[PDB]
């Protein structure tokens, strides 16, 4: 079945989806096998032979820089008895030996040496049929390398749909980003969708959940404490895509959630570059560069421009996920500003992050209650801003709503989520999505 978990236009969703164990199993087939997933950045596997390990849903893959400058990714599972081969998170290897029996693999996945081949294996083994299981699709977006196990998938840039347009001022026209490793890693007891859903456009929560650190850290976001006064019309927007990804835009808040010790230099530098950009890119897009995006690229990759955080919510089980937390920096920032901003991302939304801790109270109980008999068929509502959404604005790229405090990317996400969840392939997903912008504006 799995139909009718999210209603028409993505307006409600069954609470059970943040807890049911049967469905989490379905998701591994239908969400994380099918869609694009964040692996790493060029900045962390630069020289040939550099490798990292990264999770693709439940599966762990090895991501290796090729000698021809390429990148390819294989399962960190052996072809013999199935042991795990590489137990380092990162490194640089002339090859990968699996120390159960000694099988030798190329940095390119080929089975290159099996001990005692001539003696014991003879005719029963042929090394060209025993390569690591290869990730078929690997493409890139201004340094950020993404994998997918389904080869029928739309190319990365198409998959990113109308959200790419907003990312480009910060991911491209800034000169580009490098990612600062290693990432922070923590367990929080919450289904992965709860963070995806928070980051795809939960600005509603900033004034209340985060009321303490706004008062005490004096983020550029303090004009929201207590959910008292929203910043007036001239606040921002929120946007969603055909392929699920969405984001909320908050004008000129380049310093994001950072505390007053950094707010000066961050806004100095980012206003400086904004002038340069506007001559090259124009007024709207140069401002977007210096504004604050929070968004989720489907299914489980989130970023914060300005705040400069890159998260991946790696699924463990229906009520647990593993949270990786990198900082990204614009390449032409001074090294000391890079250092300061790399730490500050951790201090904010890392393992010891006071923003992410406040946030986990909501995310944990959100999913605990999903398991309870009387609340599992309850309907969660994402109605905030509904009916004020529009397609084909002369100036703004996707399906757009008029505040960052909206739930327009919420319905976008769970529209796509439900579309993947009930469909057997990419072919069927497209057939449930021909009318995707119409579905989400509807009656209006």
């Amino acid at each position: 079945s799995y139909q009718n978990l999210v209603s028409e236009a993505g307006l409600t969703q069954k609470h059970l989806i943040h807890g049911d164990k049967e469905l989490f199993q379905h998701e591994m087939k239908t969400i994380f096998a099918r869609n694009w997933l964040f692996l790493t950045h060029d900045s962390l596997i630069p020289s040939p032979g550099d490798y990292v390990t990264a999770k693709m849903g439940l599966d762990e893959v090895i991501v290796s820089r090729q000698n021809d400058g390429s990148v390819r990714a294989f399962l960190n599972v052996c072809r013999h008895r199935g042991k795990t081969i590489v137990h380092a998170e990162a490194g640089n290897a002339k090859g990968f030996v699996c120390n159960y029996h000694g099988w030798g693999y190329g940095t390119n996945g080929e089975l290159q040496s099996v001990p005692f081949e001539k003696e014991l294996y003879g005719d029963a083994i042929k090394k060209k049929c025993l390569g690591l299981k290869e990730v078929p699709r690997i493409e890139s977006f201004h340094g950020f390398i993404y994998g997918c196990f389904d080869a029928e998938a739309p190319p990365l840039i198409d998959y990113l749909g109308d959200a790419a347009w907003y990312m480009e001022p910060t991911f491209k026209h800034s000169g580009g980003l490098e990612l600062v490793g290693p990432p922070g890693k923590v367990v929080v007891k919450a289904n992965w969708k709860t963070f995806a859903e928070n980051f795809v456009g939960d600005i509603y929560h900033v004034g209340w959940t985060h009321a303490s650190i706004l008062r005490v850290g004096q983020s550029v976001f303090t004009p929201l404490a207590g959910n008292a006064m929203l910043p007036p019309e001239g606040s921002g927007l929120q946007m969603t895509s055909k392929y699920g990804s969405g984001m909320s835009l908050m004008w000129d808040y380049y310093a994001g959630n950072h505390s007053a010790d950094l707010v000066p230099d961050l806004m100095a530098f980012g206003g400086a570059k904004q002038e340069k950009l506007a001559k090259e890119i124009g007024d709207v897009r140069a401002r977007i560069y210096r504004s604050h995006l929070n968004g989720t690229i489907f299914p489980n990759n989130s970023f914060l421009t300005g705040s400069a955080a890159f998260k991946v919510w790696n699924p463990i089980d229906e009520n647990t996920t593993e949270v990786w937390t990198y900082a990204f920096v614009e390449k032409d920032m001074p090294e000391d500003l890079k250092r300061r901003l790399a730490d500050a991302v951790q201090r904010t939304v890392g393992p010891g992050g006071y923003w992410e801790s406040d946030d986990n109270d909501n995310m944990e109980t959100l999913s605990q209650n999903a398991k309870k008999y009387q609340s599992s068929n309850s309907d969660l509502i994402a109605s905030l801003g509904f009916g004020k959404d529009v397609y084909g604005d002369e100036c703004y790229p996707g399906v757009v709503g008029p505040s960052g405090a909206s739930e327009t990317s919420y319905r976008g996400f769970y529209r796509a989520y439900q579309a993947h969840i009930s469909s057997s392939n990419w072919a069927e997903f497209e057939n449930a999505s021909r009318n995707w912008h119409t579905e989400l504006t509807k009656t209006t």
């Binding site: 998170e89 290693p182 929080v188 005490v216 850290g217 505390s259 951790q346």
Partner: protein, 192 residues
């Protein structure tokens, strides 16, 4: 005394630190540092964060908790950064943290959280160049329970620098903690 050429598994850092201690046999200094670490751990347990910061934390403080990336033991070419800074705070950043805890709308702290912490394996040595300085090593288990059936236990070794203050006090200058689990088991919003 440790020979790193024979003792194949020892870090250069781990070895340089081991050679500071267990040489001079100063009972006075040990009773001092025990009072210090205990008073500090007592203050953090009853959530007296302001007093901790004012009396225990020296203003030039570096407060660092790192998460090291798992490399091969044979790695000789990969040179990108070793470690994330879970915590890397100066006094102002700590002050924000303390002020965050005490703020009346800090939702996670209603009902009051229970912290109990166990401090063992303490040793100390005077720095040879600047004798006002004190190297102190201590191990810590931290028990954190809240909302009935939520519990989290942390284990950590803390390499500490403490300096003698003019008023007769002693305050913390540097804390380095290499937190030993790579994936932290829960969100470490606590002072180690």
């Amino acid at each position: 005394m440790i020979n790193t050429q024979e003792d194949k598994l020892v870090s250069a850092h781990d070895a340089e630190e081991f050679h500071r201690f267990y040489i001079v046999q100063d009972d006075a200094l040990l009773q001092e540092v025990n009072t210090l670490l205990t008073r500090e751990a007592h203050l953090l347990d009853i959530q007296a964060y302001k007093a901790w910061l004012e009396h225990c934390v020296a203003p030039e403080i570096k407060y660092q908790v790192i998460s090291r990336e798992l490399r091969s033991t044979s790695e000789r070419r990969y040179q990108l950064n070793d470690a994330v800074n879970i915590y890397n705070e100066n006094y102002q950043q700590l002050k924000v943290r303390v002020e965050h805890q005490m703020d009346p709308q800090n939702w996670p702290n209603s009902p009051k959280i229970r912290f109990t912490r166990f401090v063992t394996n303490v040793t100390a040595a005077k720095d040879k160049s600047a004798p006002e300085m004190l190297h102190v090593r201590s191990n810590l288990i931290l028990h954190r329970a809240r909302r009935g059936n939520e519990v989290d236990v942390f284990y950590a070794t803390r390499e500490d620098k403490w300096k003698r203050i003019e008023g007769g006090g002693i305050q913390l200058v540097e804390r380095f903690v290499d937190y030993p689990e790579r994936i932290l088991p829960h969100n470490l919003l606590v002072f180690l």
